[PDB]
């Protein structure tokens, strides 16, 4: 697993990053949340259970549970609301961590200086990630 995800992660980790700053500085809230369903699952899936040693690949299967699990609906909701709004939602420009996980939006949102693809690839990097491992 390691390299196939680390070769495709970086290229999307960075295809975000590379151009994050070159795309000037677009306004975005669900991004960090969605960049945390990435960099909180890939960056902890290589190093998840496929791991430094390869005989215990079910801890990732549980990080691959609360992974694009969210990563799906985060971008799935995100998209839904663009043309199909709601009274009950919001629209913001802010941090948050309900248990002090703070540095996470004073660095990956701080050091930042289309959804079409996100909505689908987050579900696409799921069923493929599900089938062959479950």
């Amino acid at each position: 697993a390691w390299l196939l995800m680390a070769f495709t992660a970086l290229a999307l980790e960075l295809t975000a990053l590379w151009f994050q700053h070159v795309m000037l500085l677009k306004p975005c809230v669900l991004c960090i949340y969605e960049r945390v369903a990435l960099f909180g699952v890939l960056g902890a899936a290589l190093i998840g259970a496929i791991a430094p040693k390869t005989p215990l690949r079910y801890v990732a299967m549980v990080i691959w549970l609360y992974s694009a699990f969210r990563g799906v609906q985060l971008t799935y909701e995100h998209t839904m609301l663009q043309l199909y709004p709601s009274p009950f939602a919001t629209c913001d420009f802010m941090v948050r961590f309900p248990e002090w996980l703070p540095l996470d939006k004073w660095v990956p949102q701080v050091f930042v200086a289309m959804p079409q693809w996100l909505l689908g690839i987050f579900i696409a990097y799921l069923i493929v990630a599900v089938l062959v491992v479950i």
Binding site: P87, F88, C91, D92, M94
Partner: protein
């Protein structure tokens, strides 16, 4: 028994006193903002649930729109001072969002003119000191109950509001629920 922190409202951690009797931020930019007030007529409903003379209060907020973001607030400012909120509320909403016709201070200017506002009396209370002041009061209540986005209610500067701890398939119901929640919280 059946009214819970974390559920229908989330209690404010850092309570601000000197607050309204119920604030209600919003932007002329957030569809959800629109929906909340144009598609559901929520304030009106909630007003009707409120007791004797509990100041329903409302503001507008900046972050979305930047340059116009501002103008709009002072657009509103006036509209608090004069009287007008009720009469500009919709046009402007429709103006910015739906009809896609607002662009500059002047475009807004005119939208007051039309609804029975005098092109000077507006500019005659635009720059006034009792509307530079109101403009702060807005940013300052907003930095003070730690707003991140919009819509958003707040009672007594002590309990935010939480729509998710409620139904979200039945509009008729989501409403009757929402309003109660504010009533209950107005006496606490």
């Amino acid at each position: 028994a059946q009214y819970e922190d974390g559920k229908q409202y989330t209690t404010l951690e850092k309570p601000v006193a000197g607050a309204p009797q119920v604030l209600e931020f919003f932007s002329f930019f957030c569809p959800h903002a629109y929906q909340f007030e144009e598609v559901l007529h929520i304030s009106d409903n909630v007003k009707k649930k409120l007791p004797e003379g509990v100041k329903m209060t409302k503001y507008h907020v900046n972050f979305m729109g930047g340059d116009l973001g501002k103008d709009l607030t002072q657009a509103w400012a006036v509209a608090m001072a004069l009287g007008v909120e009720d009469k500009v509320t919709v046009p402007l909403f429709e103006g910015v969002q739906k009809t896609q016709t607002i662009r500059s201070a002047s475009d807004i200017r005119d939208v007051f003119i039309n609804a029975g506002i005098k092109g000077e009396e507006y500019d005659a209370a635009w720059n006034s000191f009792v509307v530079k002041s109101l403009v702060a009061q807005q940013e300052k209540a907003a930095a003070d109950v730690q707003l991140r986005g919009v819509p958003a209610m707040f009672v007594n500067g002590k309990y935010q509001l939480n729509p998710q701890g409620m139904d979200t398939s039945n509009m008729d119901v989501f409403v009757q629920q929402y309003a109660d929640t504010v009533k209950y919280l107005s006496e606490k």
